[PDB]
Design a protein around this ligand. Structure first.
Ligand SMILES: Cn1nc([C@@H]2O[C@H](CO)[C@H](O)[C@H](n3cc(-c4ccc(Br)c(F)c4F)nn3)[C@H]2O)n(-c2cc(Cl)ccc2C(F)(F)F)c1=S
Ligand SMILES: [Cl-]
Length: 138
């Protein structure tokens, strides 16, 4: 087991063809999960499953610049379930992050922060037991 919140360093930043894989289990009665790809204090890509936002399950994605959140991108496809094991894969492509959950494409998030090699850490937080967090080049 890994302790949450967990920081995964991304040495030399992200780059196209880098694949990040996160394995864990959603806690029973979970409320939220978050992945935060950080450029210093900025959050280049925040991926935030919300299990009960006005009795709806939604994934909210955004960017934080100078401590301000931007325009939300929302996805109603919601592949996570309380109590159950998941796999998140984030593939860096030239123009977006591509996210798959449990081997099924979920969403893409266009790069707003364009200095990819300065996005040097991934934070993993929220209502999970974390099994593994790693990266490889494809
Ligand atoms: C309903 N709601 N949600 C938000 C913010 O909406 C953002 C996305 O647009 C982020 O999700 C942010 N957030 C979430 C977490 C967070 C932490 C700990 C774990 Br553990 C974990 F899983 C996590 F998601 N930290 N910051 C969240 O607080 N805000 C919000 C709140 C403030 Cl004070 C200012 C601006 C906003 C808004 F502009 F974005 F809307 C509202 S109101
Ligand atoms: Cl939240």
């Amino acid at each position: 087991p890994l302790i949450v919140p967990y920081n995964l360093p991304l040495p030399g930043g992200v780059v196209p063809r880098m694949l990040i894989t996160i394995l864990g289990t959603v806690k029973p009665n979970a409320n939220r999960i978050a992945l935060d790809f950080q450029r210093g204090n900025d959050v280049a890509f925040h991926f935030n499953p919300r299990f009960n936002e006005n009795n709806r399950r939604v994934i909210v994605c955004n960017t934080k610049l100078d401590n301000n959140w931007g325009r939300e991108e929302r996805q109603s496809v919601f592949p996570f379930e309380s109590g159950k094991p998941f796999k998140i894969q984030v593939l860096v492509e030239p123009d977006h992050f591509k996210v798959a959950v449990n081997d099924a494409h979920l969403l893409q998030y266009n790069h707003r922060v364009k200095k990819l090699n300065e996005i040097s850490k991934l934070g993993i937080s929220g209502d999970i037991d974390l099994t593994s967090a790693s990266y490889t080049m494809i």
